[PDB]
Design a protein around this ligand. Structure first.
Ligand SMILES: C=C(/C=C\C[C@@H](O)[C@@H](O)[C@H](O)C/C=C/C=C\[C@@H](O)C[C@@H]1O[C@H](C[C@@H](O)[C@H](O)C[C@H]2O[C@H]([C@H](O)[C@H](O)CC[C@H](O)/C=C/[C@H](C)[C@@H](O)C[C@]3(O)O[C@H](C[C@@H](O)CCCCCCC[C@@]45C[C@@H](C)C[C@@](C)(O4)[C@@H](C[C@@H](C)CCCCC[C@@H](O)[C@H](O)[C@H](O)[C@@H](O)[C@H](O)[C@H]4O[C@H](C[C@H](O)[C@H](O)/C(C)=C/[C@H](O)C[C@@H](C)[C@H](O)C(=O)N/C=C/C(=O)NCCCO)[C@H](O)[C@@H](O)[C@@H]4O)O5)[C@H](O)[C@@H](O)[C@H]3O)C[C@@H](O)[C@@H]2O)[C@@H](O)[C@H](O)[C@H]1O)CC[C@H](O)[C@@H](O)[C@H](O)[C@H](C)C[C@H]1O[C@H](/C=C\[C@@H](O)[C@H](O)C[C@@H]2C[C@@H]3C[C@H](O2)[C@@H](CC[C@H]2O[C@H](CN)C[C@H]2O)O3)[C@@H](O)[C@H](O)[C@H]1O
Ligand SMILES: *[C@@H]1O[C@H](CO[C@@H]2O[C@@H](C)[C@@H](O)[C@@H](O)[C@@H]2O)[C@@H](O[C@@H]2O[C@H](CO)[C@@H](O[C@@H]3O[C@H](CO[C@H]4O[C@H](CO)[C@@H](O)[C@H](O)[C@@H]4O)[C@@H](O)[C@H](O[C@H]4O[C@H](CO)[C@@H](O)[C@H](O)[C@@H]4O)[C@@H]3O)[C@H](O)[C@H]2NC(C)=O)[C@H](O)[C@H]1NC(C)=O
Ligand SMILES: CCCCCCCC/C=C\CCCCCCCC(=O)OC[C@H](COP(=O)(O)OCC[N+](C)(C)C)OC(=O)CCCCCCC/C=C\CCCCCCCC
Ligand SMILES: CCCCCCCC/C=C\CCCCCCCC(=O)OC[C@H](COP(=O)(O)OCC[N+](C)(C)C)OC(=O)CCCCCCC/C=C\CCCCCCCC
Ligand SMILES: CCCCCCCC/C=C\CCCCCCCC(=O)OC[C@H](COP(=O)(O)OCC[N+](C)(C)C)OC(=O)CCCCCCC/C=C\CCCCCCCC
Ligand SMILES: CCCCCCCC/C=C\CCCCCCCC(=O)OC[C@H](COP(=O)(O)OCC[N+](C)(C)C)OC(=O)CCCCCCC/C=C\CCCCCCCC
Ligand SMILES: CCCCCCCC/C=C\CCCCCCCC(=O)OC[C@H](COP(=O)(O)OCC[N+](C)(C)C)OC(=O)CCCCCCC/C=C\CCCCCCCC
Ligand SMILES: CCCCCCCC/C=C\CCCCCCCC(=O)OC[C@H](COP(=O)(O)OCC[N+](C)(C)C)OC(=O)CCCCCCC/C=C\CCCCCCCC
Ligand SMILES: *[C@@H]1O[C@H](CO)[C@@H](O[C@@H]2O[C@H](CO)[C@@H](O)[C@H](O)[C@H]2NC(C)=O)[C@H](O)[C@H]1NC(C)=O
Ligand SMILES: CC(C)CCC[C@@H](C)[C@H]1CC[C@H]2[C@@H]3CC=C4C[C@@H](O)CC[C@]4(C)[C@H]3CC[C@]12C
Ligand SMILES: [Mg+2]
Ligand SMILES: [Mg+2]
Lengths: 993, 294
């Protein structure tokens, strides 16, 4: 799978002859191949079917999730825990079990997290499968001089293949004979209109010539013949799909922030250990015990609920997205939208609707605009003049297309119409504001029609007049406005008729250039009442000689048409530009149309100008003007092929409104890379196969759901099942909102750390009874902390999020030193002091004053000293003093919950005050209530002192942590106050997360 | 990267900041931590003011009282060879440490050791738990009372020829009055004889029914010759109000002990405000494993 030979732009053998072609692959132009020869080749190289994707089993996708995120930190934690239980078990028959529990718990936090993340990734895959539909297809091949329809998988290189309007081109063909055949090259090349396939050659580029049919394309109208030049995976879209499969994914931004988080967490772990190692050696301990102390401190610096909390956090935002029809296959792809700063979009199928619609109309010397939006939410065009009625009769009659049988259910715009795209657009507009055309057509019987001619350049027909008072004959004709203008002498103004003096002839010329400059295609409609005295009701006007007056007709008005953009396209582009997101158009369409759509959607702001526009406004050559005075630029693909790396960098560095036109799929990838070489996130939004390699390499691919291709749908990361484009705006908003909340939840789960390690440090250094047990830390680590941390995600915005610039990746991280200074430095310290207060209170009320506790650990833990004197002289047995230590653990845990109240409240808001935002978050309130109920339950249920070792507390001890909490609240409130009044000051660059 | 974030010479920065930054941050942390320390200290001083010096506010975790012993046996096992002298040294050093506090030289003069009844007697109340009448007075407890286990005649206390002693002791509790069982028809078998009301009885036995035969003659030594604690040494007024206070002791000689075999001996005190616990094996009773292997 040579990628460099697949990265190259397609080459071909188009510029040849029919004899050279038949001489190279071997084939009879009039008899085709022989069946024996056909099978010899079929077996020689392989069926004409693309290779299936590389599959994967479900246990594999579950192992990936098990060894991921920070499941490594926890895997070792678990392994270390069971190692210590092994050694402790084989060494003594009476070892503590703080390790068999610590290890099965840690392990569960990893297995459970993997199951949840998994379930998510499977849910998305099923709905993805219910879309991959495949109805078998069969092609028409001519062998031994006979026509046969065989499965698409049996076509080989060399046989003759015939196509008919409505069928799909089986393989890459070389047209040999055509009969007004047109094909839809929208998915592969990106051409919105049907390009006619002619046996003659026209352009050096194989994608532009007409003598080649392509894979996955469809023949709109006409029939054609051709020799199969390319077959199987070796086809154009085969090499493209192969390129998509042989590319990388990338590395999500969110995954880099989490990696940096683990980096800092380990930094502080080895720091606390090497330091308490030198300190313990300064106190007289040996090297074996001191080494074991360095192990215990590193293990304590492991947030286990941070994994489950972060997973639930990410999972919550994805549901909000799925409620509005935005599905993500992975789980972290939910944040990439908010961090995006450059959106590369596609035109055909993404920015547009890929369907032709009547845009502007000319009548009564006045331009009228029609509604060209999917759901028909706009302005009508004043249907009160007689002119419009005559126009409806002209277009509705002189038109041969008709809705496809059985569409009585779909809407007027999304139904299937058999015919050209122009007659279809006209039929839809008439059926839209003029009622049923089928009755309008049966109301006037068509007598004689002369089909569109290459010489006449017009389409005319005569029908009877439904006027019950006028039995005359009506004649209507449509065609190019110039040809029709040369055939009139009257004008239907407001109903009456008038001559064609040069005043209205010039108004017609300016109208023609107005509709033409708009990138639209205009047509002219005229009609005339045939005198029933010279052509009675019985006379038959056979289409042979001049039976109708070609000239002296009555011109009614012009009718333009073009593919309009989707409803929320301009507003969404404006919203993205408002948020500081650079919008760059990248499409393989004609530049004359790309520039117009760009100006119409907001990419090229009205007023900005290109170098050619300046040369045209001044009437001077283009090589004289300076390119720095041009803000917007249109880069052609042909020119893009010959450009250096620095030139592309300068193109993106100096032009703010860029539009890349006539770019091949391979070139689309080069543009995305040119944006990433400089340092920023990219989101590619597309639909066809030409978009497959761009969505894969982009930081986040957005594929259309209904109008998208299966390859680009399988290679993307986000799917728009409703084809609505406003979802992009919703995504960029949610991506930010869920980011500031992760910051809050991390500072919350990190604040509780300090009051969890300090007891052991003072234990080894100061020699006092153990303040915080292991089964209590587990109760806080996975009990109290979680619900509140999960609730911190439901926090609304503080300021307008859709107003700030995109975050810089090289400077604004997710976890900086400003957070560590708060959680580890200021709040956690106060929480630890409060805990040590409740501790000393419990031991002083029972008999051990703070002066006699220093130096007691060695005898406090001896199992054979049944007489330990306290500050008053009482003798305490071993189990009696242990019961008090356990009650001190219970109250320490309750103190943690009490200080967590004020921590969850000061963590709710980052800058704003509580009296401003407000406690409108019901989940947070529920978190506080549940957090308290759980602590009371664990401390007063019969049987806890035998299972978990938590004894009941006396009512006066629950109030030992209240002052510390109030103080935490007041300190953080004044902290958030100086930041507001003093922007950019010390408190901001020192404590503003 | 590696080098610049460590020390650049244009902005004169170390690790990231300049000299004035490290100073602003260090000064802030010093003031912050100083305030934290002062607040914690104030909240601890008010705690020193809340409690009383002559009496622990809560006395529910130490009741009833335990029963400790000397020597200091690890795992509650006393195993030693009658030949190798370096086998029972860890035991004798403890026994001696305990008895070394009852030396007559320590108990001298009128204070604060007053002479009490040589025969068990009733309680003695030296007033309330106040500082009004100064330091209270405690009864004297002579070493010699313990006849064959006193370290005055046979320093080793018995371990020298296969006859060990075990000095039992009741855990000191402030304001605790020991209450012995009454003479009513319901009383254990053992306790019937020598019902000295003023004496709290202590009686050892065998954990299993089999071991009975392998255990010989349990000879208890104590005040007045009884196997108990005289009620006159109660109650205890606490260290602050009764420094130089001695708690009664009871010696137990396990004469006629079978050789080369682990014997489980359970000793138990009896009384009203005495209750045992299936979890704490030292509350009221105690277990000892003796094996005089020779
Ligand atoms: C399984 C674990 C590990 C242990 C588990 C353990 O329990 C058990 O499994 C047991 O092990 C079971 C194992 C059993 C194994 C076998 C047994 O079955 C079998 C039986 O074992 C029994 C024993 C058993 O009974 C034992 O007792 C068990 C205990 O073992 C440990 C003991 O204590 C202790 O270790 C005993 C071990 C042994 O004795 C050690 C001997 C020495 C090594 C060695 O010396 C001996 C000897 O010499 O070794 C020789 C071999 C040599 O080649 C080796 C070469 C030596 C290299 C020398 C270089 C040294 C070095 C190294 C440099 C890097 C740095 C440097 C500084 O030092 C540098 C300096 C140089 C220059 C020094 C050069 C010196 C040279 C020395 C050498 O040459 C030799 O010494 C020399 O050759 C000697 O021969 C010679 O004699 C020398 O003597 C002298 C030398 C000196 O001595 C020596 O040098 C000294 C002192 C050095 C001093 O440091 C110097 C100081 C003074 C100082 O410098 C000084 O001055 N300062 C002065 C200050 C001053 O003035 N200040 C003035 C101030 C003025 O202002 C002399 O000087 C020298 O000249 C001379 O040469 O170079 C050779 O073999 C021989 O020679 C040999 O004798 C302890 C335990 O292990 C165990 O209980 C036997 O009796 C029995 O017979 C046998 O059958 C995993 C742990 C768990 O993971 C963890 O949970 C753990 O459980 C907790 C931590 C427990 C803790 O907490 C518990 C309660 C609750 C906990 O459980 C909770 O879990 C806590 C949790 C933790 C965390 C956090 C939190 O809380 C919770 C939250 C977590 C959760 O929440 C999270 C979310 N937040 C999520 C989740 O994570 O989890 C407590 O209960 C625990 O108690 C507590 O610990
Ligand atoms: C409480 O009483 C303890 C015993 O008191 C003795 O008996 C009472 C009834 C009185 O008569 C009193 O006057 C007696 O002293 C008392 O402990 C005793 O302290 C002395 C002084 O250190 C010890 O004497 C020394 O003995 C060692 C050898 O001891 C051996 O036996 C003991 C057991 O008894 C073992 O533990 C040892 O390991 C030895 O096996 C002698 O080597 C030592 O020599 C020193 O004196 C000689 C002159 O005699 C000098 O030439 C040397 O240089 C040395 O300076 C002493 O003779 C005595 O052993 C010790 N008794 C016990 C049982 O340990 C205790 O201190 C008192 N405590 C208080 C708080 O009042
Ligand atoms: C029994 C007793 C109990 C003991 C309990 C102890 C509890 C432990 C509590 C806290 C742990 C402290 C450990 C240190 C934490 C430092 C935080 C840290 O390392 O965070 C990382 C930051 C990175 O941040 P960033 O993402 O913005 O980088 C962007 C870089 N880009 C953009 C250029 C790529 O790196 C930096 O900050 C740069 C590194 C700065 C390191 C400063 C080291 C100071 C440590 C000790 C000082 C002690 C002196 C005491 C004497 C004072 C004089 C009187
Ligand atoms: C000595 C002891 C020390 C203890 C220290 C720890 C303390 C921590 C616990 C509680 C702290 C409470 C702080 C009180 C803050 C009140 C703030 C407030 O009231 O700000 C008013 C807001 C603002 O409104 P607005 O103008 O934006 O509205 C606009 C409406 N429009 C749009 C229609 C116009 O109004 C709103 O938020 C809407 C109404 C919300 C009403 C909330 C009431 C619930 C408050 C607390 C719950 C109790 C938790 C107890 C935990 C213990 C469990 C056992
Ligand atoms: C919207 C949805 C709302 C849902 C809310 C649900 C809330 C549920 C509320 C209560 C149900 C809790 C479980 C009930 C446990 C009953 C245990 C019990 O009745 O025990 C009685 C006996 C004690 O007998 P004794 O006094 O003779 O023992 C003397 C022992 N001596 C003398 C040796 C010391 O027990 C024993 O013996 C053995 C003790 C067995 C230990 C079982 C405790 C379970 C341990 C941890 C699970 C707790 C996780 C927290 C879940 C929070 C959910 C919100
Ligand atoms: C969403 C919010 C979740 C909130 C839940 C809080 C999370 C809790 C997190 C960690 C706590 C789990 C630690 C497990 C502790 C097991 C302790 C154990 O095994 O001790 C063994 C004891 C033996 O004691 P001994 O030697 O003194 O007996 C002497 C008996 N003599 C003397 C009479 C013979 O035997 C006994 O207690 C026998 C009774 C057995 C009791 C088993 C209780 C298991 C409790 C929890 C496990 C399920 C938790 C799953 C929820 C995860 C939440 C994420
Ligand atoms: C911003 C900070 C907010 C902090 C809020 C903290 C709330 C704390 C809640 C309750 C306090 C604990 C309950 C105290 C119960 C003690 C029971 C007790 O046994 O007490 C006895 C000792 C006195 O012993 P003695 O030796 O002198 O007796 C000598 C007797 N003879 C003269 C006869 C010899 O009593 C004493 O120490 C009493 C000394 C206590 C002094 C601390 C006062 C705490 C301040 C305010 C409490 C909150 C109430 C107002 C609520 C406002 C809501 C917004
Ligand atoms: C049980 C737990 C109890 C805990 C109680 C804690 C109370 C302690 C609270 C605060 C004490 C710390 C005060 C430190 C003052 C020295 C700091 C200093 O040297 O600062 C210098 C700067 C002036 O330099 P610059 O910005 O002009 O230079 C620009 C330079 N460039 C560019 C780097 C920004 O100072 C400034 O900015 C002004 C900023 C001053 C910091 C205000 C922080 C106030 C926080 C809390 C006070 C509220 C206590 C409420 C307690 C109620 C108890 C019931
Ligand atoms: C101490 O125990 C010994 C047994 O070890 C008792 O003496 C034995 O008595 C039986 C008769 O009942 C004789 O057959 C043995 O020969 C005796 N053995 C020895 C070593 O004397 C002795 O009576 C017990 N004494 C006390 C006071 O309990
Ligand atoms: C709001 C903050 C900054 C106030 C902090 C006040 C500090 C400085 C106060 C509060 C309580 C005070 C202590 C209260 C009681 C005593 C006992 C006395 O025998 C020596 C002084 C000493 C130890 C005091 C020292 C100063 C002290 C710790
Ligand atoms: Mg497309
Ligand atoms: Mg991707």
């Amino acid at each position: 799978d040579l990628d460099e030979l697949k990265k190259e732009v397609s080459m071909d053998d188009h510029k040849l002859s029919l004899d050279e072609l038949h001489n190279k692959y071997g084939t009879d132009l009039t008899r085709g191949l022989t069946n024996a020869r056909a099978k010899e080749i079929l077996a020689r190289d392989g069926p004409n079917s693309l290779t299936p994707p590389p599959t994967t089993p479900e246990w594999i996708k579950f192992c990936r999730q098990l060894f991921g995120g920070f499941s490594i930190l926890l895997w070792i934690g678990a392994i270390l825990c069971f190692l210590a239980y092994g050694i402790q078990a084989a060494t003594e028959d009476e070892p503590a079990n703080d390790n068999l529990y610590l290890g099965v718990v840690l392990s569960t936090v990893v297995i459970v997290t993997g199951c949840f993340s998994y379930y998510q990734e499977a849910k998305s895959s099923r709905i993805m499968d219910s879309f991959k539909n495949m109805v078998p297809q069969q092609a028409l091949v001519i062998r031994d001089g006979e026509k046969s329809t065989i499965n698409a998988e049996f076509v080989v290189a060399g046989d003759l293949v015939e196509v008919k309007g409505g069928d799909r081109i089986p393989a890459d063909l070389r047209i040999i004979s055509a009969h007004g055949c047109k094909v839809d090259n929208s998915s592969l090349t990106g051409e919105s209109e049907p390009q006619t396939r002619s046996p003659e050659f026209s352009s050096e580029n194989p994608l532009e010539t007409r003598n080649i049919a392509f894979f996955s394309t469809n023949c709109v109208e006409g029939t054609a013949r051709g020799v199969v030049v390319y077959t199987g995976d070796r086809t154009v879209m085969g090499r493209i799909a192969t390129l998509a499969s042989g590319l990388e994914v990338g590395r999500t931004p969110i995954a880099i922030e989490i990696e940096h988080f683990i980096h800092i967490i380990t930094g502080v772990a080895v720091f606390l250990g090497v330091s308490f190692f030198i300190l313990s050696l300064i106190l007289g301990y040996s090297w074996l015990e001191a080494v074991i102390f360095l192990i215990g401190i590193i293990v304590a610096n492991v947030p286990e609920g941070l994994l489950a909390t972060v997973t639930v956090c990410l999972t919550l935002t994805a549901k909000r997205m799925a409620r509005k029809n935005c599905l993500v296959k992975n789980l972290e792809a939910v944040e990439t939208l908010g961090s995006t700063s450059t959106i590369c979009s596609d035109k055909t199928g993404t920015l547009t609707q890929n369907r032709m619609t009547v845009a502007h109309m000319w009548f009564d010397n006045q331009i009228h605009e029609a509604d060209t939006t999917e759901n028909q939410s706009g302005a009508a065009f004043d249907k009160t003049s007689a002119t419009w009625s005559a126009l409806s009769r002209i277009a509705a009659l002189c038109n041969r297309a008709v809705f496809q049988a059985g569409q009585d259910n779909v809407p007027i715009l999304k139904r299937s119409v058999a015919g050209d795209a122009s007659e279809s657009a006209l039929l839809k507009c008439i059926e839209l504001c003029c009622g049923s055309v089928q009755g309008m057509r049966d109301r006037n019987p068509k007598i004689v029609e002369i089909p569109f001619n290459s010489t006449n350049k017009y389409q005319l027909s005569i029908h009877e007049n439904e006027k019950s008072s006028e039995s005359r004959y009506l004649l209507v004709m449509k065609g190019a406005p110039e040809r029709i203008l040369d055939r009139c002498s009257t004008i239907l103004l407001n109903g009456a008729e008038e001559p064609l003096k040069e005043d209205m002839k010039e108004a017609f010329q300016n109208a023609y250039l107005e509709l033409g400059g708009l990138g639209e295609r205009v047509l002219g409609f005229c009609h005339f009442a045939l005198p029933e005295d010279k052509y009675n009701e019985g006379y038959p006007f056979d289409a042979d000689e001049p039976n109708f007056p070609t000239t002296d007709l009555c011109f009614v008005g012009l009718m333009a048409m073009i593919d309009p953009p989707r409803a929320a396209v301009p507003d969404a582009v404006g919203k993205c530009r408002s948020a500081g997101i650079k919008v760059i158009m990248v499409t393989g369409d004609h530049p004359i149309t790309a520039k117009a759509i760009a100006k119409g959607v907001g990419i090229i702001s009205e007023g900005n100008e290109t170098i050619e526009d300046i040369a045209a406004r001044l009437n001077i050559p283009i090589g004289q003007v300076n390119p720095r005075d041009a803000k917007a630029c249109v880069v052609h693909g042909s020119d893009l092929k010959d450009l250096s790396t620095e030139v592309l960098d300068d193109i993106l560095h100096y032009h703010t409104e860029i539009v890349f036109a006539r770019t091949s799929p391979q070139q689309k990838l080069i543009i995305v890379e040119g944006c990433q070489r400089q340092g920023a996130i990219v989101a590619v939004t597309g639909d066809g196969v030409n978009d497959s390699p761009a969505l894969k390499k982009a930081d986040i691919g957005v594929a259309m759901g209904i109008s998208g291709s299966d390859v680009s749908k399988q290679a993307a990361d986000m799917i728009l099942l409703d084809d609505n484009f406003a979802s992009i705006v919703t995504g960029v908003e949610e991506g930010r909102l869920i980011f500031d909340n992760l910051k809050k939840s991390i500072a919350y789960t990190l604040t509780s750390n300090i009051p969890e390690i300090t007891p052991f440090l003072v234990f080894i250094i100061g020699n006092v009874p153990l303040p915080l047990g292991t089964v209590t830390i587990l109760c806080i680590d996975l009990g109290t902390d979680m619900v509140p941390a999960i609730s911190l995600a439901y926090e609304q915005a503080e300021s307008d999020i859709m107003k700030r610039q995109p975050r810089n990746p090289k400077t604004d991280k997710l976890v900086n030193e400003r957070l560590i200074s708060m959680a580890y430095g200021q709040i956690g310290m106060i929480q630890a002091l409060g805990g040590f207060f409740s501790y000393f209170v419990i031991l002083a009320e029972n008999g051990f004053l703070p002066m006699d506790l220093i130096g007691k650990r060695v005898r406090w833990d001896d199992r054979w000293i049944s007489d330990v004197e306290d500050s008053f002289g009482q003798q305490w047995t071993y189990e009696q003093r242990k019961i008090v230590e356990f009650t001190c653990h219970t109250s320490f845990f309750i103190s943690i919950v009490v200080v967590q109240w004020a921590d969850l409240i000061i963590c709710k808001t980052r800058r704003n005050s509580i009296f401003q935002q407000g406690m409108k978050n019901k989940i947070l309130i529920f978190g506080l209530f549940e957090e308290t109920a759980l602590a009371a339950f664990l401390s007063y249920c019969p049987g806890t002192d035998v299972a978990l070792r938590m004894y009941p507390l006396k009512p006066s001890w629950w109030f030992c942590a209240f002052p510390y909490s109030l103080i935490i609240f007041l300190y953080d409130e004044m902290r958030r106050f100086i930041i507001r009044r003093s922007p950019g000051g010390w408190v901001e660059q020192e404590t503003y997360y | 990267g590696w080098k610049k974030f460590l020390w650049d010479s244009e902005k004169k920065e170390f690790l990231g900041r300049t000299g004035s930054s490290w100073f602003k941050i260090f000064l802030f942390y010093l003031i912050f931590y100083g305030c934290l320390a002062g607040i914690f200290i104030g909240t601890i001083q008010v705690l020193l003011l809340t409690l009383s010096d002559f009496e622990p506010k809560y006395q529910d975790r130490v009741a009833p009282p335990g029963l400790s012993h000397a020597p200091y046996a690890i795992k509650t096992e006393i195993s030693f060879s009658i030949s190798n002298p370096k086998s029972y040294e860890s035991f004798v050093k403890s026994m001696h440490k305990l008895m070394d506090l009852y030396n007559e030289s320590s108990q001298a003069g009128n204070s604060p050791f007053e002479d009490c009844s040589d025969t068990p007697a009733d309680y003695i109340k030296r007033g309330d738990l106040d500082d009004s009448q100064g330091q209270k007075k405690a009864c004297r407890f002579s070493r010699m009372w313990l006849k064959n286990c006193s370290g005055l005649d046979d320093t080793t206390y018995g371990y020298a020829e296969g006859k060990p002693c075990v000095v039992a002791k009741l855990n000191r509790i402030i304001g605790f009055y020991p209450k012995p069982l009454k003479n009513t028809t319901d009383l254990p078998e053992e306790l019937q004889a020598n019902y000295n009301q003023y004496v709290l009885p202590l009686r050892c036995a065998a954990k299993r029914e089999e071991d009975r035969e392998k255990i010989g003659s349990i000879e208890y030594f104590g005040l007045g010759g009884y196997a108990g604690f005289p009620l006159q040494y109660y109650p205890y007024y606490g260290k602050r109000l009764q420094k130089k206070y001695l708690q009664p002791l009871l010696a137990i000689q396990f004469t006629n002990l079978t050789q080369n075999m682990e014997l489980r001996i359970e000793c138990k005190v009896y009384g009203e405000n005495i209750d045992y616990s299936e979890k704490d094996r030292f509350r009221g009773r105690f277990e000892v494993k003796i094996e005089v292997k020779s």
